[PDB]
Structure 1
Amino acid sequence: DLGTENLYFQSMRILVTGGSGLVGKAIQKVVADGAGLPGEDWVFVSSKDADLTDTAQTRALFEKVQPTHVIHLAAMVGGLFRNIKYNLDFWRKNVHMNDNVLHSAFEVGARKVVSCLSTCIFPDKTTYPIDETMIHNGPPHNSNFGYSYAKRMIDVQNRAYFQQYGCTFTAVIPTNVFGPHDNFNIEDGHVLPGLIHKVHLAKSSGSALTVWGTGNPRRQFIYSLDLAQLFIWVLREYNEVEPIILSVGEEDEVSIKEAAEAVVEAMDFHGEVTFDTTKSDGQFKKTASNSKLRTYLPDFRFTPFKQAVKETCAWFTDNYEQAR
């Protein structure tokens, strides 16, 4: 329910950082298709509009736009998952970005900010499933600690702004996102868009599909379009400082193998599918509970997985040249 029974409307200016990305582009579509309400001006920006690692440029963007609300998606994110690690660069640039954005929002007097966290913030050693309370219950995985701790500190900023200044800054925690306008780069991208590109190359080359690792790791996937809907809802209706996980349930986890099968079917691929165990498996699970989301939106129906994959595969094929 992204409409309203209200007869009157407030003038809202909604700045969306990282608007040109996977998540941001999904919000644009959902809004452009009529999820936008009267009085709401949606302003989507990218790094062209301002480098958010720079305080002066961020301040200037916020002075120009004067947002009443902020959805904060921007992060320095590539190339995470590459061979050599750059934990200081990722820690320092992301903390600067997050501080610039939250504090400019504070300065302009924004009513609400919703930032985007990641399952990489959760503790390495933890019970399962993981919920929003457990975010700080032990250190994150060492592989990319810099990035993880920078995200965790968004929660700490939100809590501090609330406690001292009364601001309603909060955050959402998506699981693994996929959809149109993803980064489909095979070396640097996530597994699901990477698989879509890999299968596309297997048809164009007539080769076989080589999946990295065992195919055993389990993941919760969420369609960018489903996430966008939940994001707009959170912006309008969710008022806890504590973050909220946006994800399908623990029972709808699927293995990398099952995910590759969904792509193979969707792209109508008949070549061999092999699992290269020489490349390392990542974490086996990062299973998140959506209990909280279910208390707020019990009747919300996610797009079925195979359909969401087909649409994404269809988009990639139809926009191959312009895609990432």
Structure 2
Amino acid sequence: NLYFQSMRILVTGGSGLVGKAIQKVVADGAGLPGEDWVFVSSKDADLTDTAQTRALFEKVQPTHVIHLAAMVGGLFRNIKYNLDFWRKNVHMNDNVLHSAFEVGARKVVSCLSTCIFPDKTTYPIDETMIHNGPPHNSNFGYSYAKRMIDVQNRAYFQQYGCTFTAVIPTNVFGPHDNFNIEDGHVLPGLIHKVHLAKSSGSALTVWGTGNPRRQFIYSLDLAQLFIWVLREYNEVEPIILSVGEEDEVSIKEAAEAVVEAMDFHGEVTFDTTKSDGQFKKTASNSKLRTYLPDFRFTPFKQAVKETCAWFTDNYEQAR
């Protein structure tokens, strides 16, 4: 008898929007034979605590790690607490990457954000420009915390030859998202706002001007890409997992898709008192398209309708 060792994939923050997305895709036929997929949350172990993190990694001895856990929040949450967003995430990313390493994990794929890119820059922004200037002053604590993941990934590789990498998704949306009207992101935040407005018979209030351009990525698409990165992408440099620069949409265009999907025919107003954040974050998927040129993304408006459908179908259980 001759027997080959199985792969143990530990997904940190597996209860989240991206976490639950990867769960669905792996079950829907992405998991290969032998592979054991372990999806954990805060209840499992508080990743800010070093002792709790080292215990989870010594118990579940992973060969592969997908680092999705983080102190996440939308523009109106992360701009209020830049010290907490910095400290907690640096603590978390340190604990996860080091515990993975000392438990002998072969690969670690962490999740970055398009807010890591510099404020004053040229467009489209590629993977080389991640450190070419400071990020936007609003959420710099969270931005620099995610930037330092790449610094760690390059540091582990130069000192130990570690295949620790990262991915840069755009604005993620989809089922099992945080639909809080204050803590959530733009798309989940509006999906709740239209739901309440359609129920109460009230008008829709979109925060900011409504002009900032954003690239949106469906959670189930990102999950498909995330699984591929873990199984084939062996570069230390991160990869931008995003839809084309030509497939960019405005906040007003996104708000219109949410109004269309939920069949809302009330008033739509823009609260210009609220911050608009960054006007453009336009990312280049040129590196992604050299690897997967025939990968087809879910159409924005169809994906929005499905996210709106899931939220109506599952509301009592939703966030």
Structures share a fold, TM > 0.5?
Answer: yes
For the Cα contact (< 8 Å) 1:9–1:39, is it kept in 2? Answer: no
For the Cα contact (< 8 Å) 1:59–1:104, is it kept in 2? Answer: yes
Give 3-state SS (helix, strand or coil) of 1:316's partner.
helix
Structure 1 residues 148-183: Cα deviation after superposition (integer angstroms, max 9, x where no partner): 111110000000110110100000000000000111
Whether 1:143 aligns to 2:138 is yes
Q: Give the C-alpha shift of residue 32 in structure 1.
A: 1.0
For the Cα contact (< 8 Å) 2:167–2:240, is it kept in 1? Answer: yes
User: How many angstroms apart in 2 are the aligned matches of 1:143 and 1:132?
Assistant: 22
Give 3-state SS (helix, strand or coil) of 2:76's partner.
coil
Q: Give the C-alpha shift of residue 143 in structure 1.
A: 1.4
Structure 1 residues 33-59: Cα deviation after superposition (integer angstroms, max 9, x where no partner): 111110100000000110001111100
Compared CA separation, residues 48 and 83, structure 1 to 2 (3 A): closer
User: How many angstroms apart in 2 are the aligned matches of 1:7 and 1:270?
Assistant: 65
Compared CA separation, residues 123 and 31, structure 1 to 2 (3 A): same
Judge which range, 289-298 or 268-277, deviates more. 268-277
User: How many angstroms apart in 1 are the aligned matches of 2:78 and 2:56?
Assistant: 35
TM-score, structure 1 as length reference = 0.95
Q: Counterpart in 1 of 2:129?
A: 134
User: How many angstroms apart in 1 are the aligned matches of 2:276 and 2:154?
Assistant: 35
Q: Give the C-alpha shift of residue 87 in structure 1.
A: 2.1
Structure 1 residues 232-259: Cα deviation after superposition (integer angstroms, max 9, x where no partner): 0000000000000000010000001111
Matched length:
319
Q: Give the C-alpha shift of residue 194 in structure 1.
A: 0.8
Identity %: 100
Judge which range, 220-229 or 10-19, deviates more. 10-19
Q: Give the C-alpha shift of residue 107 in structure 1.
A: 0.2
User: How many angstroms apart in 2 are the aligned matches of 1:204 and 1:211?
Assistant: 17
**Structure 2: stretches of 5+ with no match in the other structure:** none
User: How many angstroms apart in 2 are the aligned matches of 1:29 and 1:153?
Assistant: 30
Q: Give the C-alpha shift of residue 280 in structure 1.
A: 2.6
Judge which range, 48-57 or 140-149, deviates more. 140-149
For the Cα contact (< 8 Å) 1:9–1:38, is it kept in 2? Answer: no
User: How many angstroms apart in 2 are the aligned matches of 1:210 and 1:81?
Assistant: 15
TM-score, structure 2 as length reference = 0.97
- Superposition RMSD in Å: 1.9
Q: Give the C-alpha shift of residue 24 in structure 1.
A: 0.3
User: How many angstroms apart in 1 are the aligned matches of 2:48 and 2:275?
Assistant: 33
For the Cα contact (< 8 Å) 1:199–1:267, is it kept in 2? Answer: yes
Whether 1:175 aligns to 2:170 is yes
Q: Give the C-alpha shift of residue 279 in structure 1.
A: 2.1
User: How many angstroms apart in 2 are the aligned matches of 1:79 and 1:132?
Assistant: 23
Q: Counterpart in 2 of 1:44?
A: 39
Compared CA separation, residues 242 and 54, structure 1 to 2 (3 A): same
User: How many angstroms apart in 2 are the aligned matches of 1:46 and 1:219?
Assistant: 29
User: How many angstroms apart in 2 are the aligned matches of 1:177 and 1:247?
Assistant: 10
Compared CA separation, residues 230 and 79, structure 1 to 2 (3 A): closer
Whether 1:34 aligns to 2:19 is no
Q: Give the C-alpha shift of residue 84 in structure 1.
A: 6.8
